[PDB]
Amino acid sequence: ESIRMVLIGPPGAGKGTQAPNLQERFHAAHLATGDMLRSQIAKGTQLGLEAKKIMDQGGLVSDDIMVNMIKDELTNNPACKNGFILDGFPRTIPQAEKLDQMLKEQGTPLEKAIELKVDDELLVARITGRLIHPASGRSYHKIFNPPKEDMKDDVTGEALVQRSDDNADALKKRLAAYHAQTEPIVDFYKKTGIWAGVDASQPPATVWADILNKLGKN
Ligand SMILES: Nc1ncnc2c1ncn2[C@@H]1O[C@H](COP(=O)(O)OP(=O)(O)OP(=O)(O)OP(=O)(O)OP(=O)(O)OC[C@H]2O[C@@H](n3cnc4c(N)ncnc43)[C@H](O)[C@@H]2O)[C@@H](O)[C@H]1O
Ligand SMILES: [Mg+2]
């Protein structure tokens, strides 16, 4: 129950769905930069308000902002001493290089980078059917993964919402940004030898068993 890892995948691939599994199993901290940004928006902070406009256009928030955010969480979040699951970070080559240097100075290098590979065609249905519980970050899908109490988060009973960047127009922008900016990082980790690919087109429990097999832990 110590892992230091990155989850990489296109929008809707399943990072947020699998992260709880990894978190349970390894008692690692789940560091999800999308959720962090959405917290900023919810607190109504100036960073949150300017990030929202970029997020809804399917753009990427500045590397400087994102690196600083993660630097602080690694440094002064106690939970990141067990290990951590990075979800949505790094998202660009500069973020990947700077993370590399941060973890070198701390002497705690990444063990695995798991790519959740899934064709883009499948991603539209996942995005447009998604409901989230804003408070926990938990995602459901109207077709593929329903709440038992529909439109209600099961674990709190609290209402589910749609994400404001979860539409086909923004998603086209999101997918392009992923192929242009994020997908090069997979090669970076291939060169460092910590990459493993997973078939994220399978259903959740099957992807999870695939991830466990690929972490060398099952
Ligand atoms: N480091 C950074 N640098 C720059 N900018 C940054 C940044 N970090 C964040 N940002 C910014 O913030 C924005 C949002 O970031 P973020 O929120 O991190 O978005 P993302 O990377 O686009 O990912 P998603 O959350 O959409 O996908 P997911 O894979 O986690 O999906 P889920 O598991 O819910 O699953 C999707 C849906 O399908 C479902 N599902 C999951 N798995 C399966 C399966 N196997 N089969 C069927 N249904 C499934 C779910 O139930 C759900 O309905 C960015 O676009 C950018 O603006
Ligand atoms: Mg997510």
Q: Which atom of ligand 1 is nearest the CA belonging to 58?
A: 55
169 burial class (0-12, 13-18, 19+ CB within 10 angstroms)?
exposed
Alpha-carbon distance of 214 to 218, in angstroms, equals 8
Q: Are strands 130-133 and 29-32 parallel, antiparallel or unpaired?
A: unpaired
Best of 116, 141, 169 for a ligand 1 pocket test (most atoms within 8 Å of beta carbon): 141
Best of 61, 73, 120 for a ligand 1 pocket test (most atoms within 8 Å of beta carbon): 61
15 is catalytic: yes
- In order of 31, 61, 91, 134, 140, the CA distances from 49 in angstroms are 21, 12, 21, 16, 26
Measured in Å, residue 15 CA sits from the centre of ligand 2 at 6
Method by which the coordinates were obtained: X-ray
DSSP assignments along the chain, one per residue? ---EEEEE-STTSSHHHHHHHHHHHH--EEEEHHHHHHHHHHHT-HHHHHHHHHHTTT----HHHHHHHHHHHHHH-GGGGT-EEEES---SHHHHHHHHHHHHHHT----EEEEEE--GGGHHHHHHTEEEETTTTEEEETTTB--SSTTB-TTT-PBPB--TT-SHHHHHHHHHHIIIIITHHHHHHHHHT-EEEEETTS-HHHHHHHHHHHTT--
- Resolution for this experimental structure (Å): 2.0
Alpha-carbon distance of 126 to 132, in angstroms, equals 12
Alpha-carbon distance of 189 to 98, in angstroms, equals 14
174 is catalytic: yes
Which residues approach ligand 1 with their CB closer than 6 A? Answer: 9, 11-17, 33-34, 37, 54-55, 59-61, 66, 88-89, 91, 95, 126, 129-130, 139-141, 144-145, 174, 200, 202-204, 207
- The tokens for 7 are 């989850």
Alpha-carbon distance of 185 to 93, in angstroms, equals 6
187 neighbors 96 (Cβ within 8 angstroms): no
CATH topology of domain 1-218: Rossmann fold (3.40.50)
Alpha-carbon distance of 182 to 174, in angstroms, equals 10
- Ligand in closest contact with the CA of 9: 1
- Ligand in closest contact with the CA of 96: 1
Which letter, b or e, does each residue of 21-46 get, where b requires 16 or more Cβ atoms within 10 Å of its Cβ?
Answer: bbbebbebbbbbbbbbbbebbeeeee
163 is catalytic: yes
- In order of 23, 101, 208, the CA distances from 214 in angstroms are 16, 25, 10
198 neighbors 180 (Cβ within 8 angstroms): no
Alpha-carbon distance of 172 to 76, in angstroms, equals 36
The full set of domain ranges for the chain reads 1-218
Q: Which atom of ligand 1 is nearest the CA belonging to 166?
A: 26
Alpha-carbon distance of 85 to 27, in angstroms, equals 10
- The tokens for 33 are 């930069």
| Dmax (CA) of the chain | 47
Alpha-carbon distance of 71 to 58, in angstroms, equals 24
- Ligand in closest contact with the CA of 166: 1
Best of 39, 87, 126, 127 for a ligand 1 pocket test (most atoms within 8 Å of beta carbon): 126
The size of the chain, in residues, is: 218
